[PDB]
Structure formats: C-alpha cells, structure tokens
Subunit: 151 residues, 3 copies
Amino acid sequence: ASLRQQVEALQGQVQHLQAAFSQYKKVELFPNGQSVGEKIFKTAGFVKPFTEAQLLCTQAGGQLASPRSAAENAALQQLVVAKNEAAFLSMTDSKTEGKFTYPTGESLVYSNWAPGEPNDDGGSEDCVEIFTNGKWNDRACGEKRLVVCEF
Amino acid sequence: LRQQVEALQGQVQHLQAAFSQYKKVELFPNGQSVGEKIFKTAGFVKPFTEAQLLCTQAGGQLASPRSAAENAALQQLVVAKNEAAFLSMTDSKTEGKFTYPTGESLVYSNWAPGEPNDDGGSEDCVEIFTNGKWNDRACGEKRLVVCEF
Amino acid sequence: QQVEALQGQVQHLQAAFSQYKKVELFPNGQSVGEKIFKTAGFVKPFTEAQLLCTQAGGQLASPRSAAENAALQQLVVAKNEAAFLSMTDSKTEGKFTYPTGESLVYSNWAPGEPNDDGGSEDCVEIFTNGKWNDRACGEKRLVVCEF
Ligand SMILES: C=CCO[C@H]1O[C@H]([C@@H](O)COC(N)=O)[C@@H](O)[C@H](O)[C@@H]1O
Ligand SMILES: C=CCO[C@H]1O[C@H]([C@@H](O)COC(N)=O)[C@@H](O)[C@H](O)[C@@H]1O
Ligand SMILES: C=CCO[C@H]1O[C@H]([C@@H](O)COC(N)=O)[C@@H](O)[C@H](O)[C@@H]1O
Ligand SMILES: [Ca+2]
Ligand SMILES: [Ca+2]
Ligand SMILES: [Ca+2]
Ligand SMILES: [Ca+2]
Ligand SMILES: [Ca+2]
Ligand SMILES: [Ca+2]
Ligand SMILES: [Ca+2]
Ligand SMILES: [Ca+2]
Ligand SMILES: [Ca+2]
C-alpha cells in the first residue's frame, strides 16, 4: 500500500528531472557544443599543440574529437566553422608511419581526407586537422589547432 | 521490493541534489534563470540574422522578454558583458508593428523615450541597453548574442 | 514491474547526467569530492568577484584540503591567472577567515606569507604553483567560484 504511493511519488519526481534536464542539455550545448547520436563534441574555444590538447581532453574525462562517421564529422565541422579555426582530431600515425589510429590503437573506421592526403609533408606530419570544409589533412603535431573534445 | 524502492528513492534524491548543483554551475557566469525560462549569452556579437540562426540551431530563439521580470533578468547579462543585445522581435513585415518570431504582437515592451523611431527609415530590429531600455536599431549592426531556452 | 521500469529510466538518466557533467566542466570547471570549482574566465576586484559568486548561489573558491587546493590549482594553471580565494583577515588583522567567520582549517602560504605587505593586504590569491599570498583586495584576480 505505502509502497505503491512511493512509486507514484517517484514517477512525479522523475518526470520533473527529465523535463528540467532536457532544457539544460540545450542550454549547455550553446554555443560551444554539438550533440550527435550519443556523442557530444565540445570546443574549449582556443588553440593548443596536439600533446597539450590531448592532455586537456583526457584529464576532463574524454578525448580529442574522433569522428567515426559522416554524421559525427559534420557535427564537428559545425564547431570548426563557428570558431573559424581548424581543429585537431585524436588520431595519429606516430606509432607506424602511414597507419592512422585512434588513441586505443584501433585503425580508422572512417576518414574524410582532402585529395592527396595524408602526405606526411616534409616527412613530419603525424597528427590530423579538420578544415572548415570538413576535410582532413595530416599536419605537424607541434602546430596549434582549435581544441575540441568528445564525451 | 521495499529494499529496491528505497534504493530508487536514494538514486532520485542523489540526482535531485546533483542536478541542482549542476544548474548553478551551468548558469555561471553566462546565464540567467527567470521562471521557466533561461537566458544565456554566447559572449560575443553578431548581426541579427546570424544571431537568430545561432539560437534557432541551438534549439531556442533570440531573447524575448515578455515581462518586467524577464527583462530585468536579461538586463543582468547585458550589464555583465557591458554589451547591448538583440531581442528576437522585429517589424520587418509591417513597419511600425513589432512582433515575435511566430508573428504575434508584443505582450510587453520597455522602449526608451521616443522609440521605436525607425531612424533613417531603416531600423527593424531591437537592442536592449545596459539600463534595460529598448531601441529599434539597424538589423545589420552587431550586438551581443543572447538566446532563451 | 513499474519499479524495474522506473529504475531503468533513472539509471538512463544517471548516465546522461554523468555525461553532461563532464561536458559542463570542460574547460572552465573542476570537480573534487562533492565540490565544484568554476571560473568566470575574467578578472575582478575582490568585492565584485565575491558578489558574482554569491549571486550565482555559491561563494569564492575556498580550498579546505590539499586535494581541493590541487583541483583549484588546475584552473589557475589552465587560465594562467592567479585567483582570489574567499578568505580575508579584514575583521582581525592576521587572522584569515571564511565568509562564515570560521578560521582556516587549511592553508598553503608561499614562504614569507602572509606578510600584510604595505600594511594593507587582507585578501588571498592563489598562484599557478598552488601557493597562497595575501594581497590587496582592490587588485583584480581571476574569478573562481565554488558550488
Ligand atoms: C595550406 C595549404 C598548403 O598545404 C600544403 O602544406 C601543408 C603544410 O606543410 C603547411 O605547413 C607550413 N609550415 O607551411 C601540408 O600539410 C599539405 O598537405 C600541403 O602539402
Ligand atoms: C545618443 C544616441 C543617438 O541615437 C539616435 O541614433 C540611433 C541610431 O541611428 C544610431 O546609429 C549609428 N550608426 O550611429 C537611433 O536608433 C536612435 O533612436 C536615435 O535616433
Ligand atoms: C608573484 C609573487 C610575488 O609576490 C610578491 O609581491 C606581492 C604583491 O606586492 C604583488 O603586487 C604588485 N603590484 O607587484 C606581495 O603581496 C608578496 O608578499 C611578495 O612581496
Ligand atoms: Ca611519422
Ligand atoms: Ca605521418
Ligand atoms: Ca598533409
Ligand atoms: Ca522597415
Ligand atoms: Ca522599423
Ligand atoms: Ca531607434
Ligand atoms: Ca588589515
Ligand atoms: Ca592583512
Ligand atoms: Ca603578501
């Protein structure tokens, strides 16, 4: 008897939380975030060298942007376009030249290379930047690019 | 069952406390909550058309204060950033008649003395000053972007 | 089965909320224990910074342990701007207290501090190295609140 009343009580509290949270999700993503599927991209709004950007994302409980589909890539591109700053992706071929992988060592399941890329220009481009047009280019990891993490 | 229900209650209570803490964190320092509405500034300026798209694409719309209370709330963000902001309303359809994005007429207004005056015959947008008063201004001007959710 | 169902929704809510919390904290917030530090990203004199935090429903950063100090230190380091803490010794020179009047339960003064240099340093700033220094309250420092 009393338990049925508690259940109905919990239903009302849960509905309130769901509604309140749905509103805050939109508020939170504006203007530096993008939701795509179950992934969320968020830019720090500034630029940093690869290693520093990687650390920022990992320490925050996530990792550098790792678009695994056209949909995620387009979502990420929106942030790049908004800030008008090419961003770093999480993938590199630092372990084995010519073989780009995710931080986990897994090979890419998606790529959107601009024509002729990756080309390891000057024999020293192991990181990846995404342009405002959504295309990718391998680039020197020492360069500073917009920091975007995924959660 | 009771041991489970009591567990569920514990989870809901935890969520209520964590969510309340999170809301304060989110709103600091670029948002304002007033009633069921939330105003949040992007912290930068854009022309009207661009600011409007930014808000719509984010799932909301440009700041649309409908009462003295909401206007005061929005004013706080303007004062904080010390940058006048665009409101969502315009009289682009019918000169002399300002409306919300849906097309409805204003239910509240806080015009500065003599405004709106369509200065130069080309002011169809609205800006809110640090004093909270409104002034119709050229939509091509860049103002603080503030959306409501 | 309503309990089972409702619990599924709640646990799905816990997952979504946990994800949004990490997103919220990047890159201007830091969580330590049940406390959350968040910087406004700009500087302000003590009084103004204090008002902002209280108006936001929190208070100025008040690290009460080495752990909390380390978390706050991350924000200062990331922003590369020293920040004001909530404590002052305005009521009784030499005795720093929290807004509530309670005396410190933790401190991390840099060597030689607090020295009330100039005869008027009643506020506290935390450097990028995590150490504290008493400073004039009229100076502008990074605004960091705790919730
Ligand atoms: C941007 C268009 C030119 O793009 C050329 O040069 C880029 C960098 O080498 C430029 O770096 C510097 N320091 O100039 C290469 O990544 C790219 O594949 C192409 O070979
Ligand atoms: C003290 C303020 C004067 O304000 C005058 O001029 C404003 C703009 O036209 C200024 O535009 C530019 N470009 O300066 C009008 O909105 C306002 O109603 C008044 O007529
Ligand atoms: C970075 C640590 C140096 O800290 C030195 O300088 C501080 C302020 O005087 C700095 O302010 C200005 N305007 O120079 C003193 O409070 C502190 O005891 C020490 O003498
Ligand atoms: Ca290589
Ligand atoms: Ca390479
Ligand atoms: Ca290249
Ligand atoms: Ca007109
Ligand atoms: Ca007009
Ligand atoms: Ca006017
Ligand atoms: Ca004193
Ligand atoms: Ca003193
Ligand atoms: Ca000192």
